[PDB]
Ligand binder design. Structure first.
Ligand SMILES: *[C@@H]1O[C@H](CO)[C@@H](O[C@@H]2O[C@H](CO)[C@@H](O)[C@H](O)[C@H]2NC(C)=O)[C@H](O)[C@H]1NC(C)=O
Ligand SMILES: *[C@@H]1O[C@H](CO)[C@@H](O[C@@H]2O[C@H](CO)[C@@H](O)[C@H](O)[C@H]2NC(C)=O)[C@H](O)[C@H]1NC(C)=O
Ligand SMILES: *[C@@H]1O[C@H](CO)[C@@H](O[C@@H]2O[C@H](CO)[C@@H](O)[C@H](O)[C@H]2NC(C)=O)[C@H](O)[C@H]1NC(C)=O
Ligand SMILES: *[C@@H]1O[C@H](CO)[C@@H](O[C@@H]2O[C@H](CO)[C@@H](O)[C@H](O)[C@H]2NC(C)=O)[C@H](O)[C@H]1NC(C)=O
Ligand SMILES: *[C@@H]1O[C@H](CO)[C@@H](O)[C@H](O)[C@H]1NC(C)=O
Ligand SMILES: *[C@@H]1O[C@H](CO)[C@@H](O)[C@H](O)[C@H]1NC(C)=O
Ligand SMILES: *[C@@H]1O[C@H](CO)[C@@H](O)[C@H](O)[C@H]1NC(C)=O
Ligand SMILES: *[C@@H]1O[C@H](CO)[C@@H](O)[C@H](O)[C@H]1NC(C)=O
Ligand SMILES: *[C@@H]1O[C@H](CO)[C@@H](O)[C@H](O)[C@H]1NC(C)=O
Ligand SMILES: *[C@@H]1O[C@H](CO)[C@@H](O)[C@H](O)[C@H]1NC(C)=O
Ligand SMILES: *[C@@H]1O[C@H](CO)[C@@H](O)[C@H](O)[C@H]1NC(C)=O
Ligand SMILES: *[C@@H]1O[C@H](CO)[C@@H](O)[C@H](O)[C@H]1NC(C)=O
Lengths: 389, 122, 317, 49
């Protein structure tokens, strides 16, 4: 601790005093993860392998719920020309645990795959399919010559070159405003058909259902651990909770917008999160020019966590507690002060307010001074400071 | 202004004890006042009374306190023991002496009567 | 405040970003600790005026005056006065926030006030100058009367009346304090403005400042490193701004409280340890004496003053 | 000062962005109002003797 203060002061000599120098904080011992123990596997492998994709004229919509997903096998696959995510990382998708997923499928020109990003502008965006600004998901696309290109032009695929008003995000509607693509294997890649699938997740504000492959683990209570419930992740000590959650509630939110209670996803159990113990650490030290001894005060946390002495200000370690009061040297708090005294030790004690005295009062007695002393008292007052500019 | 250019009647403003005077001194970015103060010391107990009933009239001290050294009564200034004889000019009078609680019987000396006797002799 | 704990959770990714902003997260701690120690200094200056812990004589024949309302109750656990017990009833973490206990506990303040009050009762202003010199309370009141320009006989001839009025007035204060809490507003506001500030600071953790989410753990669990720091630094900026605003407000408020404590200490010195010839400095009317009383984070002075009444005209030359 | 009128003009687009900065506007307005009433207190304590 003494050297901790020395660094904190950027000095090799530490004058007598009490210095705040660090923060005691309990590290977690193990990591606990909980997820709803569903067995179903998600049907993603089918949306990427459908015989016929839709066209932005009537772009196709599919919804995913109640299943376990694995996006690593999809991200690493070779067929996918572009796979870019917004509001979430491609590798992380195995860590989160969602309420629902929307998969939108369509075909589009290769030149127009630049036009699908969220908040982007262009005819395929404002007239066919607009992604909003608040989009959180992944855009996926790959060239599809052998699927959606054929001799004579695959006229089956349509799009809108004009509309009387720009689209609201995720809207669909059904001179003439429509035109078909000229998908011929002879045509250049920019005009070749690209199959595009857009996955928009709904992050958890409710019981998550489309959720990652992470293995659930049996939990523990009354011990600071890392916890992860449906992707709600943090560190703290779990305990049984007396809060009466309504059946549709998943977690309790505190004044500081932090989750103080969570429902175990695989049980009706309701658990309370407590940020496991922490506090400030101060160093009660006499002048290094007098002694290298030292004592440590852990503020606001008592001694079963970190001689040892418990005080209203915190847990004091190193200093020795003695019950006889002094004009107190180093102020610890709540009447306790510390000092260094000759064995040589740091004593801690309740301060003395002053010498106890009683005036000899009576209804007929008065004391009068017979002599006097002239006293010269110093009083130093700062009048100004350096005129810095 | 108040301690150096004058004498401060405010207690504990210009140092502990009764303020006599002060002296300023310069200091780097500051001023040091040397407060010369008067501190009483070596006190003694004394029995006391609020007033004295002499002729049936209650006598009070114009300044100071009535203090007895055990067998005699004197009037002495408040802050320094200097026992003076209780004269009709060290004191004043207000009415009958049954109205004051704690009054004490004693005589108050009058400087005129010796002159009266001296003239009567001559 | 553990400014690292406030700005960042218990996460190293955010701590590293916060680190390369420099010494802000130590300047704030320095300022707050300065305020914290200044509070101790203020209380010391106000109540450490007395050199010794005087205490009342066992018998209470103070010329008819009845101080039992303001003197400590011998039977109480904390040796507080009856009035002090009215004041102490009429005034009413998880993010790095902490409250350090004051150095002088409330019973220590009560001890100081009782020592001052006993010194005043048994020795007048003499203990303020040097060592206490006992004096019958009737004579002390007589000399204060003389101080306000009234011949001391007026007290002695009216002592039984002057006691009653005093004993009456000290009753009135009780009725004022027990019935109406609003009297303590001056202290309560100071408490409120502090709590209200605190309630604001923590609330600022519930805002985005432009990031994607207020909660930092979700940002970490969604964005990896390069695209995650771009958002985390937004919260760093927002929360540094909020904490700096809080510390500036606290510095100004602590300066105000420093001024108030200096005034209180001056009043204690010039009205409890003596008699103030300064008009209206200690109560309306001519000042006779003052009695200090402790209160949560404050001091209450009972100014006993002399008010003329029932005036008559006369012709003069 | 009405910061929402100072920081942002008449547009709602600026107002919505300012809103997600939290209670900064409330804090500033509260401080300025405290100063305003403090001036009345200052005049009162001087001339209401
Ligand atoms: C009043 O106090 C002064 C000292 O404060 C006394 O003078 C001292 O007398 C002793 C006698 O042995 C000397 O040794 C000291 O040197 C003196 N001090 C000074 C400063 O001169 C004085 O006697 C006291 N007066 C009374 C009446 O007791
Ligand atoms: C109170 O003071 C008086 C006045 O000095 C004392 O009486 C004197 O005592 C001395 C001897 O100590 C004699 O020489 C004087 O003649 C006395 N004068 C008078 C007027 O009586 C008296 O002894 C003192 N009493 C006490 C208890 O100190
Ligand atoms: C002071 O002396 C007077 C006498 O000089 C005392 O007055 C007498 O008191 C007794 C008892 O109360 C009465 O019976 C007498 O009639 C009183 N005589 C006069 C002339 O008043 C008085 O009591 C004494 N007071 C003290 C405090 O000793
Ligand atoms: C001083 O005043 C207190 C009240 O302020 C008096 O206390 C009362 O005493 C009577 C008689 O025992 C009780 O019936 C009351 O209940 C008491 N009131 C309180 C509020 O305690 C006390 O008697 C007075 N003492 C003197 C010497 O006048
Ligand atoms: C489904 O699509 C994925 C992604 O291109 C591919 O790896 C997989 O082989 C497809 N399924 C079948 C049965 O071919
Ligand atoms: C899921 O967990 C519950 C405990 O709440 C258990 O009863 C159930 O059997 C588990 N699921 C399966 C498929 O076993
Ligand atoms: C304090 O330091 C000085 C200079 O190094 C040294 O002379 C002195 O002995 C030190 N104090 C003590 C108590 O050793
Ligand atoms: C901490 O202190 C409280 C009250 O003094 C006590 O109940 C508690 O048991 C202490 N800590 C532990 C771990 O026991
Ligand atoms: C301190 O208190 C304990 C009991 O609480 C007592 O036994 C001990 O004697 C006290 N200290 C001294 C020096 O007596
Ligand atoms: C004189 O006063 C002292 C206190 O300073 C006291 O102890 C002593 O008893 C008093 N003398 C008498 C005779 O009462
Ligand atoms: C002083 O107190 C005693 C106590 O026995 C009492 O007899 C006496 O009358 C009282 N006198 C005054 C003046 O207070
Ligand atoms: C006495 O003073 C009062 C003050 O209000 C005045 O009204 C009254 O006229 C005065 N007496 C005489 C006789 O003037």
């Amino acid at each position: 601790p003494l050297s901790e203060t020395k660094c904190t002061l950027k000095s090799f000599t530490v004058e007598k005093g009490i210095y705040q120098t660090s923060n005691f904080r309990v590290q977690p011992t193990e990591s606990i993860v909980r997820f709803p123990n569903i067995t179903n596997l998600c049907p993603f492998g089918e949306v990427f392998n459908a015989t016929r994709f839709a066209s932005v004229y009537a772009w196709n919509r599919k919804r995913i719920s109640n299943c376990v997903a694995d996006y690593s096998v999809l991200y690493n696959s070779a067929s996918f020309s572009t796979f870019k995510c917004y509001g979430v990382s491609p590798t992380k998708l195995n860590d989160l645990c969602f309420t629902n997923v929307y998969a939108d499928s369509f075909v589009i020109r290769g030149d127009e795959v630049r036009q699908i990003a969220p908040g982007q502008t262009g005819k395929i965006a404002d007239y066919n399919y607009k992604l909003p600004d608040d989009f959180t998901g992944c855009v996926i696309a790959w060239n599809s010559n052998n699927l959606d290109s054929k001799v004579g032009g695959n006229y089956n695929y349509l799009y809108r070159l004009f509309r009387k008003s720009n689209l609201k995000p995720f809207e669909r509607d059904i001179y003439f405003p429509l035109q078909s693509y000229g998908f011929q294997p002879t045509n250049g890649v920019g005009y070749q058909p690209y199959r595009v699938v857009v996955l928009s997740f709904e992050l958890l504000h409710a019981p998550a259902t489309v959720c990652g492959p992470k293995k659930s683990t049996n939990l523990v209570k009354n011990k600071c651990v890392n916890f992860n419930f449906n992707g709600l992740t943090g560190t703290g000590v779990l305990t049984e909770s007396n809060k009466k959650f309504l059946p549709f509630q998943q977690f309790g939110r505190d004044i500081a917008d932090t989750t103080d209670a969570v429902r175990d996803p695989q049980t009706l159990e309701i658990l309370d999160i407590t940020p496991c113990s922490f506090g400030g650490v101060s160093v009660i030290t006499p002048g290094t020019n007098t002694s290298n001894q030292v004592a440590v005060l852990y503020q606001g946390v008592n001694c079963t966590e970190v001689n040892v002495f418990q005080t209203r200000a915190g847990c004091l370690i190193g200093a020795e507690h003695v019950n006889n009061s002094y004009e107190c040297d180093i102020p610890i708090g709540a009447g306790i002060c510390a000092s260094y005294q000759t064995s040589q030790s740091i004593i801690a004690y309740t301060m003395s307010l002053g010498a106890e005295n009683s005036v000899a009062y009576s209804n007929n007695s008065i004391a009068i001074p017979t002599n006097f002393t002239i006293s010269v008292t110093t009083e130093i007052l700062p009048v100004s400071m350096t005129k810095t500019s | 202004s108040e301690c150096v250019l004058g004498q401060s009647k405010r207690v504990d403003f210009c140092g502990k004890g009764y303020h006599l005077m002060s002296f300023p001194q310069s200091a780097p970015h500051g001023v040091v006042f040397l407060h010369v103060t008067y501190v009483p010391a070596q006190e003694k107990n004394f029995t006391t009374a609020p007033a004295i009933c002499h002729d049936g009239k209650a006598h009070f001290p114009r300044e100071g306190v009535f203090v007895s050294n055990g067998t005699h009564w004197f009037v002495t200034q408040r802050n320094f023991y200097e026992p003076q004889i209780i004269t009709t000019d060290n004191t004043f009078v207000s009415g009958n002496c049954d109205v004051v609680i704690g009054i004490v019987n004693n005589t108050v000396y009058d400087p005129l009567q010796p002159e009266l006797d001296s003239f009567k002799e001559e | 405040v553990d400014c690292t704990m406030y700005i960042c959770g218990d996460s190293t990714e955010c701590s590293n970003l916060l680190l390369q902003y420099g010494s802000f997260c130590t300047q704030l701690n320095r300022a707050l600790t300065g305020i914290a120690v200044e509070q101790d200094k203020n209380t010391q200056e106000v109540f450490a005026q007395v050199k010794q812990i005087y205490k009342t004589p066992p018998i209470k024949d103070f010329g008819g005056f009845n101080f039992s309302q303001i003197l400590p109750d011998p039977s109480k656990p904390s040796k507080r006065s009856f009035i002090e017990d009215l004041l102490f009833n009429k005034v009413t973490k998880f993010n790095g926030l902490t409250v350090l206990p004051p150095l002088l506990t409330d019973e220590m303040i009560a001890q100081y006030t009782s020592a001052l009050l006993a010194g005043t009762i048994t020795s007048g202003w003499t203990f303020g100058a040097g060592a206490a010199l006992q004096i019958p309370f009737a004579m002390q009141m007589a000399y204060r009367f003389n101080g306000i320009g009234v011949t001391q006989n007026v007290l002695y001839e009216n002592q039984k009346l002057i006691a009653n009025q005093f004993n009456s007035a000290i009753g009135k204060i009780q009725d004022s304090l027990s019935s109406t809490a609003s009297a303590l507003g001056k202290l309560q506001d100071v408490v409120n403005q502090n709590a209200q500030a605190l309630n604001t600071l923590v609330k600022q953790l519930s805002s985005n400042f432009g990031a994607i989410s207020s909660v930092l753990n979700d940002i970490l669990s969604r964005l990896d490193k390069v695209e995650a720091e771009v958002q985390i630094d937004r919260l760093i900026t927002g929360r540094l701004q909020s904490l700096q605003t809080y510390v500036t407000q606290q510095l100004i408020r602590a300066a105000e409280i420093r001024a108030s404590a200096n005034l209180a200490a001056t009043k204690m010195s010039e009205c409890v340890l003596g008699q103030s010839k300064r008009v209206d400095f200690c109560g309306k009317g001519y000042h006779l004496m003052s009695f200090p009383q402790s209160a949560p984070h404050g001091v209450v002075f009972l100014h006993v003053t002399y008010v003329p009444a029932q005036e008559k005209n006369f012709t003069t030359a």
